[PDB]
Design an enzyme around this catalytic site. Structure first.
Site, mmCIF file in Angstrom:
data_model
loop_
_atom_site.group_PDB
_atom_site.id
_atom_site.type_symbol
_atom_site.label_atom_id
_atom_site.label_comp_id
_atom_site.label_asym_id
_atom_site.label_seq_id
_atom_site.Cartn_x
_atom_site.Cartn_y
_atom_site.Cartn_z
ATOM 1 C CD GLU A 5 39.006 44.100 43.115
ATOM 2 O OE1 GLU A 5 38.747 42.908 42.848
ATOM 3 O OE2 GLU A 5 38.196 44.875 43.671
ATOM 4 C CG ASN B 86 34.565 45.582 45.163
ATOM 5 O OD1 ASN B 86 34.445 44.547 44.517
ATOM 6 N ND2 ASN B 86 35.591 46.421 44.994
ATOM 7 C CG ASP C 79 37.602 44.171 48.082
ATOM 8 O OD1 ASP C 79 38.462 43.265 48.108
ATOM 9 O OD2 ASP C 79 36.753 44.264 47.173
HETATM 10 O O1 LIG Z 1 35.549 42.835 41.796
HETATM 11 C C1 LIG Z 1 35.634 41.841 41.052
HETATM 12 O O2 LIG Z 1 35.158 41.772 39.903
HETATM 13 C C2 LIG Z 1 36.334 40.622 41.615
HETATM 14 C C3 LIG Z 1 36.531 39.507 40.812
HETATM 15 C C4 LIG Z 1 37.083 38.304 41.343
HETATM 16 C C5 LIG Z 1 37.127 37.071 40.442
HETATM 17 O O3 LIG Z 1 36.313 37.046 39.490
HETATM 18 O O4 LIG Z 1 38.014 36.213 40.634
HETATM 19 C C6 LIG Z 1 37.430 38.309 42.731
HETATM 20 C C7 LIG Z 1 37.189 39.513 43.454
HETATM 21 N N1 LIG Z 1 36.659 40.625 42.926
HETATM 22 C C8 LIG Z 1 37.743 39.773 44.904
HETATM 23 O O5 LIG Z 1 36.880 40.656 45.587
HETATM 24 C C9 LIG Z 1 37.861 38.457 45.730
HETATM 25 O O6 LIG Z 1 37.704 38.514 46.922
HETATM 26 C C10 LIG Z 1 38.158 37.270 44.952
HETATM 27 C C11 LIG Z 1 38.637 36.023 45.386
HETATM 28 C C12 LIG Z 1 38.697 35.232 44.270
HETATM 29 C C13 LIG Z 1 39.035 33.777 44.249
HETATM 30 O O7 LIG Z 1 38.609 33.123 43.279
HETATM 31 O O8 LIG Z 1 39.699 33.318 45.205
HETATM 32 N N2 LIG Z 1 38.279 35.962 43.178
HETATM 33 C C14 LIG Z 1 37.945 37.199 43.566
HETATM 34 CA CA LIG Z 2 36.525 43.017 44.445
#
Ligand SMILES: O=C(O)c1cc(C(=O)O)c2c(n1)C(=O)C(=O)c1cc(C(=O)O)[nH]c1-2
Ligand SMILES: [Ca+2]
Ligand SMILES: O=C(O)c1cc(C(=O)O)c2c(n1)C(=O)C(=O)c1cc(C(=O)O)[nH]c1-2
Ligand SMILES: [Ca+2]
EC number: 1.1.2.7
Lengths: 571, 69, 571, 69
Positions: free
Chosen positions: A171, A255, A297
């Site tokens: 992100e 993503n 995403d």
């Molecule tokens: O693109 C990334 O590096 C990244 C990292 C993380 C993360 O490490 O918590 C999440 C996500 N994306 C995101 O796509 C996602 O759906 C998400 C949910 C969570 C969670 O722990 O509930 N982390 C993350």
């Molecule tokens: Ca993500």
């Protein structure tokens, strides 16, 4: 290493977050079963003294348990003979600013173990190996730089003398990579990036030889315009699997960045890819891109489950995986052959279907995303029909019990610049319950699947998303925690709820189990958070806030409040 | 754009109707700053150097120190 | 009011923090008893989403339970038919700076109830009345000003159409007073100060007519030099008791300010006083000063217990109280006559004894405090041999089960100026275990007492101070929570431990009980803090820090971590 | 000073040996500022006025408002 193997082969131990090398997240412990689960009661509990989402689950090595918290990532060691005494603890000193570059709550998915050491990381990018008995730091190295938006949340994964660790931050435009470190010294062995030159991505000379149509060489740059791959995402923050015989480890890359698809024309390889890499060299034997040119995403980091089952009567070495995009995938784990690609719920509409011959999603333009257009009723939503939850597999009935999300969305992207250290999303979303819940409000499901056909056996609906996952124990029970605060046990035959306990706060990790002095115990973290709980955790009320999650989960705070701890149960 | 028209194996992207084949020069040009684009690589280079020193110092001294310099 | 009386007379309800008007903190519920307590198990739990010390206990009105947290003082209403649903909640918006003027952790001792309203305060000085069914704020008024160091922590107390509320802050020179408000409108009826003119203190024309030697008029200023009484402390932040027939409420005023005794020569009346005041006018019928010219911070705010028992054969209306100074007091609650004044432990050395005729402590100069001198091995310590814990009384065996502290100290004062809003302590301390523990390291005791003689019946030692107090239920059980995280039940006959459960964090409140659908439940807050946990809660390591408590409780963090919630138990 | 020698009922304080009967003018003189000492009373006066306004407005309007002006 050999020590980890010793623990893996110790009845009642739990040295790996996903339940074992194949990550089937199950257990042969059958003391607790369908007939007596109604008598299960709380054994003891332990607060971490930290709030925010408490993902993952504790580890049990011998007669010791290791508990971990959300940021600042504290570790607590307890001897099961006296849960009241903290044998040793590690409380990291980290800059508060670390939290500012974490996309989805300051979560930590757990610890790992190897060579008599607890392998732990910190959100600020440090990876450490601590003596399992004393807590002494044997080594501490930097893996990710928060200054460029890179942090650590996933659990490390140990195989032989290697520790696999991947940074988070797509992100924020972070270019993903699986980093490999020496278990004994912490020295960097190599890192395999998700985008860029084949050399940087570490592709074997015979990469995808079994499926050339998946794409082979030069695509890490050719499927991007210019240097866009440099901030192209592909971070792997989910889970891994490992097959000792093949010496291959598996995982999915995330993503592409930004969320604004118009800013990155091209298939964007090798983001959202299922990998089969040699553990020693990191070279990819095969790689399958599930979602070319992501527009939603659908971070492809979900759990990889290795199983050996008959496909049309023929025993086959499989890898199964339920992606954020709503497709249940089953591939031959030796060569990457695509065997199954079915929708986990008929609501999935981003694709008409996945073509098994071309190996790609047959995209439906009506549910695509693009600049100067607001896409509506897109399923799955960015939260996916499956997220970071760890599911379980019953080897007897050959069934996977999946914790699913039933959430769809509206989405419109917008132009934005990239500045290292700053968020790089570029899209506004509205998320809401999918169309198939009994009252059209349900956002969670526990759905059993046959991994060789992709067909469901039964479904249990939940008010909120089944975020943490499920655990299967030989007594014929499917255990799981809910966002509203319950630990539940279902009859694996039909999903009938047989037992439940109201924990202090919602659970976002998956249950674990272990044995101690002749008794089977079930352990579950509690403390709501993660993406679903951002509204409650950060005092947000704007429906569009939290990448659109605030509106979707606005009712969660009427069922739970924050927390942080572990609850253990037994007969 | 249904993903089934591939110019090369593993390269099936197509611009959607009304959108450009190349965004450079278009109203969707991201105009990324090369200096910003290269920041991650620069950081990793410096980070790898710091870790190498820690590894070397621990090996020669017998004790691991994070702040070694 | 009449509505409160209705709840008080409802079997299984718990509308008053101290268990009833007489504050005996007991219950006639006998479903759980000595023979079956071993079978008690956790029923459900609830996290407040807040850390720091969680004092007090929840209220149960009809089929509804009301839970409260530490600062920011959140209120949660749950219907017992479904503890998973938060019917209504009130989460205050307060300036974070409020915490800076709170001496002993950001604790809250509980809610009150009256006229169909939940009466709740906030640390920032606000007192509110919320509709018990909807949570609607009927009125909200200011009671204390944090800008001058005045805050709110004690539970409000409702009697007839009056709400009694006292500010905290003696460590900041706050002049104590019991403020009385109209239960329906929140209008100030009157306030009775602890120091100053007789008019401000509100003394009846016949004040102490039964014991003129206790002192009568003009002492609120005469026992001070100049205007030192203006910043003389005397805050009442403990508990109250009320006798409907006599229309008298009782409570104890706190310690004088500053801690430096040399800066305030004189008896410092009426700080450290047990009061008997008319509820409607606030006029004191009698007042007994336990500790003239305090030299040890023996804040005299501890629980007042009203009982009717034969004293050497003659039935007498009594008031019993165990002060911080280590003396168990029993007085005639109608006229203030001093009947009993015994040391709760022989280690008490600040006084040789309390003279029943002169009515004052016979001070031992060897253990006094004074400028340019370091007092050593003084017992009790400033934390007292008894603090904010709420004890229980068994009406059948006529026994009080006291949660005591066994901690002594070294003390030396120092000169300092007074500036409203700034701390005004003026002393450096060192605290450690008392001399009578089995291994001379124990700091807690559950000791049973006969209130008519002050003699102990039995003692159970605890590693840490018994800070929260005890609850007595008719089944013959003494329930209490420990700082290290356990909820325990003792056989009231001999103090033998019959049951225990490891809660998530140490408990600093007293257990409560109620019935729902004919089933008896035991409820206990968890979340360590308060004075004992300042070291753990605020990351302090200096042994002299936390007013000297850090050193004494250095080991607590090796047994527990912070938390915040409620755990409920039943058969 | 054992607390048993009272100059008057309820007033038994005595200076400890070597300490002054009165601290004003001594090395233990607190030298408190009169205005500073009166801060609590001044605060309560203003606070009582704010509450009075809230109570009065609630009675006349029928609705309770904390911030009335
Ligand atoms: O693109 C990334 O590096 C990244 C990292 C993380 C993360 O490490 O918590 C999440 C996500 N994306 C995101 O796509 C996602 O759906 C998400 C949910 C969570 C969670 O722990 O509930 N982390 C993350
Ligand atoms: Ca993500
Ligand atoms: O003088 C005061 O107004 C005042 C206030 C408080 C409080 O309200 O927490 C404590 C005390 N003193 C202090 O004497 C004390 O022993 C204490 C312990 C605690 C606690 O909750 O553990 N509060 C307080
Ligand atoms: Ca005090």
């Amino acid at each position: 290493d050999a020590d980890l193997d010793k623990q893996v082969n110790t009845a009642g131990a739990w040295p790996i977050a996903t339940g074992g090398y194949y990550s089937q997240h199950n257990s042969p412990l059958a003391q607790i079963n369908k007939s007596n689960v109604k008598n299960v009661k709380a054994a003891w509990s332990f607060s971490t003294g930290v709030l925010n989402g408490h993902e993952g689950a504790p580890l049990v090595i011998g007669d010791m348990m290791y508990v971990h918290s959300a940021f600042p990532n504290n570790t607590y060691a307890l001897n099961l003979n006296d849960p009241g005494k903290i044998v040793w603890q590690h409380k990291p000193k980290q800059d508060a600013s670390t939290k500012a570059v974490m996309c989805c709550d300051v979560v930590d998915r757990g610890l790992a173990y190897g060579a008599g050491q607890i392998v732990k990381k910190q959100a600020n990018g440090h990876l450490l190996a601590l003596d399992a008995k004393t807590g002494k730091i044997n080594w501490e190295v930097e893996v990710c730089d928060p200054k460029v938006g890179s942090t650590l949340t996933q659990a490390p994964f140990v195989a032989k003398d290697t520790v696999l660790m991947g940074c988070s931050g797509a992100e924020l435009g972070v270019r993903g990579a699986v980093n490999a470190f020496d278990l004994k010294t912490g020295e960097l062995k190599w890192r395999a990036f998700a985008t860029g030159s084949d050399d940087s991505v570490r592709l074997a000379k015979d990469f995808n030889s079994a499926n050339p149509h998946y794409g082979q060489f030069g695509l890490g740059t050719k499927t991007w315009e210019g240097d866009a791959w440099k901030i192209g995402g592909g971070t792997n923050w989910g889970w891994y699997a490992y097959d000792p015989k093949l010496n291959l480890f598996y995982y999915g890359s995330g993503n592409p960045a930004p969320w604004n698809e118009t800013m990155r024309p091209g298939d964007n390889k090798w983001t959202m890819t299922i990998w089969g890499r040699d553990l020693d060299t990191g070279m990819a034997k095969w790689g399958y891109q599930k979602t070319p040119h992501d527009e939603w995403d659908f971070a492809g980091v979900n759990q990889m489950v290795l199983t050996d089952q008959p496909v049309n009567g023929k025993m086959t070495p499989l890898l199964s995986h339920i992606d954020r995009n709503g497709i249940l995938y089953t591939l031959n784990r030796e060569n990457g052959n695509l065997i199954v690609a079915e929708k986990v719920d008929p609501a999935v509409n981003v694709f008409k279907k996945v073509d098994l011959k071309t190996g790609t999603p047959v995209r439906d333009p009506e549910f695509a995303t693009r600049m100067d257009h607001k896409g509506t009723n897109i399923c799955p939503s960015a939260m996916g029909f499956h997220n970071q939850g760890v599911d379980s597999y019953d080897p007897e009935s050959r069934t996977l019990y999946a914790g699913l999300n039933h959430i769809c969305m509206d989405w419109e992207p917008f132009m934005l610049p990239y500045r290292a250290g700053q968020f790089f999303v570029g899209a506004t979303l509205a998320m809401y319950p999918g169309p198939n819940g009994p009252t059209k409000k349900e956002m969670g499901q526990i759905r059993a699947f046959d991994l060789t056909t992709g067909k469901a056996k039964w479904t249990k609906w939940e008010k909120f998303a089944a975020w943490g996952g499920t655990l299967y124990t030989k007594g014929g029970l499917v255990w799981y925690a809910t966002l509203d605060g319950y630990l539940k046990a279902l009859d694996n035959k039909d999903g009938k709820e047989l037992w439940n306990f109201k924990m202090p706060s919602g659970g976002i990790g998956s249950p674990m189990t272990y044995s101690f002095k002749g008794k089977q115990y079930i352990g579950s973290m509690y403390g709501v958070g993660g993406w679903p709980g951002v509204g409650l955790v950060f005092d947000l009320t704007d429906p569009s806030a939290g990448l659109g999650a605030v509106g979707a989960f606005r009712e969660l705070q009427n069922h739970t409040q924050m927390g942080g701890g572990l609850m253990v149960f037994s007969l | 754009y249904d993903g089934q028209n591939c110019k090369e194996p593993g390269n099936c992207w197509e611009n959607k109707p009304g959108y450009p084949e190349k965004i450079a020069g278009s109203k969707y040009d991201p105009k990324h700053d090369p200096v910003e684009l290269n920041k991650q690589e620069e950081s990793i280079k410096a980070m790898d150097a710091r870790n190498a020193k820690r590894i070397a110092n621990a090996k020669s001294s017998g004790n691991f120190v994070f702040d070694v310099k």
